[PDB]
């Protein structure tokens, strides 16, 4: 549902949730109406998709 | 029961039509849940146009569009609301301003 | 959801009866007596724009 | 010269026959065929927007 | 129309209650509305040294 997130570069984690000390690997993802392919996003998105 | 189960523009307009013409009215739901067309093979009119052709109801008060192939078999009043066919899509996000804004 | 563009044609809704039903003419005169008093637009506002 | 505001109300142009004329049904089966075949709209365009 | 001088009217004849009393209108062929007209209030132009 939702949490106080504690998000890093290569991963994202959280605190004060319905469980604590569980963290998620970072990734990238298309959204509704796409618009991930928008070149001004896609440039930034393809960069954020990596720790480059 | 009666008519108060239903609320909407056509319910208001049905109440106005009744108040002018003096008759009482009973709102009823088309049994097949369609506006109405005539079959390719059996030529049966379905929908509310079916209901009207088969004498199910003296009058129809719904978003039923005045169309020529319906004027062949039933009569329509003057338009009470106008319109046109149009396009519905899911809107995109409001775009973030360009990097070179 | 969102609208785009214009409209491909223009049409309208009409109150319909079985052919030759006695209601056809007093219903037409009702629809006129209503629109000539703005009742149809007032009702449209009440169900589209006031909601 | 320029418009302001929108419409004040609804009105319309209809083809009008003397009451009970035998024109009254073929006129409607004509007009509704012009609407369902898009002929009225290019009759509007040809005069408001081309010209 | 009403006094038999003309067999049909095809013109910008507005459909009204007080006219359907005496003549039969088809379904409308063109929508409209009442509106206000005025002189165009100086859609202006800047100067080159504005
Ligand atoms: C209104 Cl107020 C009245 C009528 C129409 C549309 C509107 S509005 N401005 O969209 O709310 S209509 O759909 O064009 N049908 C007309 C008929 C009434 C009367 C006969 C026709 C034209 C006059 N009313
Ligand atoms: N685009 S327009 O104003 O010239 C216009 C407006 C209208 C047209 C046709 C045109 Cl071209 N036909 C409709 C009528 C046709 C049939 C269906 C509704 C009515 C009956 N009335 S309307 O919706 O008022
Ligand atoms: N079309 C109008 C006349 C012109 C006008 O009033 O704008 C009518 O039929 O009465």
Q: How far is D7 from chain E (nearest CA, A)?
A: 5
| Overall resolution, Å | 3.7
- Do residues C19 and B65 touch, judged by C-beta distance below 8 A? no
Q: Ligand 1 mean position to B88 CA, how many Å? A: 24
Atom of ligand 3 nearest to the CA of E34: 7
Pocket of ligand 3 contains residue E33 by CB under 6 Å:
no
- Do residues A35 and B92 touch, judged by C-beta distance below 8 A? yes
Tokens for B80?
């009470």
User: Can you say how many angstroms the Cα of residue A22 is from the centroid of all Cα atoms in its chain?
Assistant: 15
H-helix or E-strand spanning residue D2 = strand D2-4
Alpha-carbon gap, residue B12 to B25, rounded angstroms: 12
Residues in contact with C11: Cβ distance below 8 Å, sequence separation at least 6, in sequence order: B65, B66, B67, B79, B82, B83, B84, B85, D35
Contact D44/C at CB under 8 A: no
Pocket of ligand 3 contains residue E12 by CB under 6 Å:
yes
H-helix or E-strand spanning residue B12 = helix B9-21
Nearest alpha carbon to residue B71 among A10, D28, E37:
D28
- Do residues B70 and B36 touch, judged by C-beta distance below 8 A? yes
3-state secondary structure chain A: CCCEEEECCCEEEEECCCCCCCCEECCCCCECCECCCCHHHHHHHHHHCCCC
On the 0-12 / 13-18 / 19+ scale of CB atoms within 10 A, D10 is buried
- DSSP string for D37-51: TTHHHHHHHHHHT--
C interface test, pick of E13, E15, E17 with most C CB neighbours within 10 Å: E17
Q: How far is E19 from chain C (nearest CA, A)?
A: 10
End-to-end CA distance of chain E: 61
Residues for chain A: how many in total? 52
């Amino acid at each position: 549902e939702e949490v106080m997130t504690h998000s890093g570069l290569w991963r994202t984690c959280c605190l004060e949730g319905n469980f604590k000390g569980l963290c998620k690997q970072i990734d990238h993802f298309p959204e509704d109406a796409d618009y991930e392919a928008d070149t001004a996003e896609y440039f930034l998105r393809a960069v954020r998709a990596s720790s480059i | 029961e009666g008519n108060e189960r239903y609320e909407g523009y056509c319910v208001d307009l049905a109440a106005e039509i009744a108040k002018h013409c003096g008759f009482k009215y009973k709102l009823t739901i088309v049994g097949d849940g369609k506006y109405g067309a005539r079959d390719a093979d059996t030529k049966i009119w379905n929908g509310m146009v079916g209901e009207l052709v088969y004498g199910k109801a003296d009058i129809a008060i719904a978003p039923l569009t005045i169309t020529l192939v319906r004027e062949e078999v039933i009569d329509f009043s003057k338009p009470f609301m106008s319109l046109g066919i149009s396009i519905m899509i899911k809107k995109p996000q409001k775009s973030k301003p360009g990097v070179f804004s | 959801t969102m609208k785009v563009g214009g409209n491909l044609d223009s049409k309208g809704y009409g109150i319909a009866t079985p052919k030759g039903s006695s209601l056809g003419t007093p219903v037409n005169l009702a629809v006129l007596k209503l629109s000539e008093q703005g009742v149809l637009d007032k009702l449209k506002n009440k169900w589209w724009y006031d909601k």
